[PDB]
Design a protein around this ligand. Structure first.
Ligand SMILES: [Cl-]
Ligand SMILES: [Cl-]
Ligand SMILES: [Cl-]
Ligand SMILES: [Cl-]
Ligand SMILES: [Cl-]
Ligand SMILES: [Cl-]
Lengths: 213, 211
């Protein structure tokens, strides 16, 4: 199968620099362009740059010209985006994509770039402790920066009924969110429930056992 | 430097309905237009290339056509899993541009939320802040008024909401409201209540601090 796997990204200060990578597998030829397309939070898709890796021809959108450079290491099957002199308007999820040298048939998973001078901070995790036959419980994930956190339950064995809310920016400038799940009332205390909160930007994972109060 | 104007910017239709999304190019793009589907926070998925060619694996309910500079995506029978933002794109060169996007919502019968309220944890209170959380679970439509009352006094300014995207199978939403108080303010009051109003119905879930 064709795969585009992105790496790089994360938090960077204004005026700073980052290099994104897009490693390709499963291609049947090299007759493909590589693209970078970004999506600022709450906004649409915006093409950023293109390269034809075998030849080196590049192409840039006005919004990034003279600031971003796209290149390619054919021997590593990897396209790069060297992003210099970053501004806050550059904050976005950055996607790499391929197209025939067709349409953009395969895309990487996306990687968030946050341009800001605020400090990384891992989350605090508090229980949402547990009428009728169905009870709800959850974990409040408070005061972290930057995004993202992911949440699972019971190490992935509990998925149905889970709602993990999009984070909200608090007036403190830190993010917050909750993850909830509904389970049978009779399952409380005979089942143990644990939310697994991953905050890779701070290299921190927090598991919280949510017990009845 | 060529614009692609999508219409409408958002729409709601029922399951099995025919949905029509259009996209007009500022200049000639020949047939060099693609259509993408994007679930929130996930990579876009290719649906249609060359104005009308279906991509491998795409259900046949999707179709596209061209008339001069006007391009149309059609979903002949909308299904719940088709909730997404749909994007048009031109590639006549490469100076690629995307349309602004069309967000499609699944229209559904009314579903009342299951409402739950959560006191702050004792652990959190040690830090000097109290978060009270109200959950509205699996409801439709999305619009709902959520109000906080403390000792029956209506609150304002001290809460924030967040809403899930539409469930891909039952087309419902879930919503959290989070009330933030200082510990001192929290400890001075007894009754915490979350009130949810939809249509002719208003439901209030409460707890008494310490009970
Ligand atoms: Cl390859
Ligand atoms: Cl664009
Ligand atoms: Cl914690
Ligand atoms: Cl699809
Ligand atoms: Cl209820
Ligand atoms: Cl009191």
């Amino acid at each position: 199968e064709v795969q585009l796997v992105e790496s790089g990204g994360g938090l960077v200060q204004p005026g700073g620099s980052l290099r994104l990578s897009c490693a390709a597998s499963g291609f049947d030829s090299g007759a493909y362009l590589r693209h970078w397309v970004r999506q600022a939070p709450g906004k649409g898709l915006e093409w950023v740059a293109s390269i034809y890796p075998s030849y080196g021809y590049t192409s840039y959108a006005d919004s990034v010209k003279g600031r971003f450079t796209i290149s390619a290491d054919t021997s590593k099957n990897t396209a790069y985006l060297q992003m210099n002199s970053l501004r806050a308007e550059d904050t976005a999820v950055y996607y790499c994509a391929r197209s025939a040298a067709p349409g953009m048939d395969y895309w990487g998973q996306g990687t968030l770039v946050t341009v800001s001078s605020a400090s990384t901070k891992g989350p605090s995790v508090f229980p949402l402790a547990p009428s009728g036959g169905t009870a709800a419980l959850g974990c409040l994930v408070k005061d972290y920066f930057p995004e993202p956190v992911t949440v699972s339950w019971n190490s992935g064995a509990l998925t149905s009924g889970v709602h993990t809310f999009p984070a909200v920016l608090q007036s403190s400038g830190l993010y917050s969110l909750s993850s909830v799940v509904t389970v049978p009332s009779s399952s409380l205390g005979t089942q143990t429930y644990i939310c697994n909160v991953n905050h890779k930007p701070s290299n921190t994972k927090v598991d919280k056992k949510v017990e009845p109060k | 430097d060529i614009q692609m104007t999508q219409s409408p910017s958002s729409l709601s239709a029922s399951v099995g309905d025919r949905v029509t999304i259009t996209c007009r190019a500022s200049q000639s793009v020949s047939s060099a237009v693609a259509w993408y589907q994007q679930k929130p926070g996930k990579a876009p998925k290719l649906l249609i290339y060359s104005a009308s060619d279906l991509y491998s694996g795409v259900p046949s309910r999707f179709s596209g056509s061209r008339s001069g500079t006007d391009f149309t995506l059609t979903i002949s029978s909308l299904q719940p899993e088709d909730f997404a933002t749909y994007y048009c794109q031109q590639y006549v060169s490469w100076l690629i541009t995307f349309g602004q996007g069309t967000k499609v919502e699944i229209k559904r019968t009314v579903a009342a939320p299951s409402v739950f309220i959560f006191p702050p944890s004792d652990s959190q209170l040690k830090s000097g802040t109290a978060s009270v959380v109200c959950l509205l679970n699996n409801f439709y439509p999305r619009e709902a008024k959520v109000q906080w009352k403390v000792d029956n006094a209506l609150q304002s300014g001290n809460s924030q909401e967040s809403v899930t995207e539409q469930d891909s199978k039952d087309s419902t939403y879930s919503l959290s409201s989070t009330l933030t108080l200082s510990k001192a303010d929290y400890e001075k009051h007894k009754v915490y209540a979350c009130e949810v109003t939809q249509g002719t119905t208003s439901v209030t879930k409460s707890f008494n601090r310490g009970e």
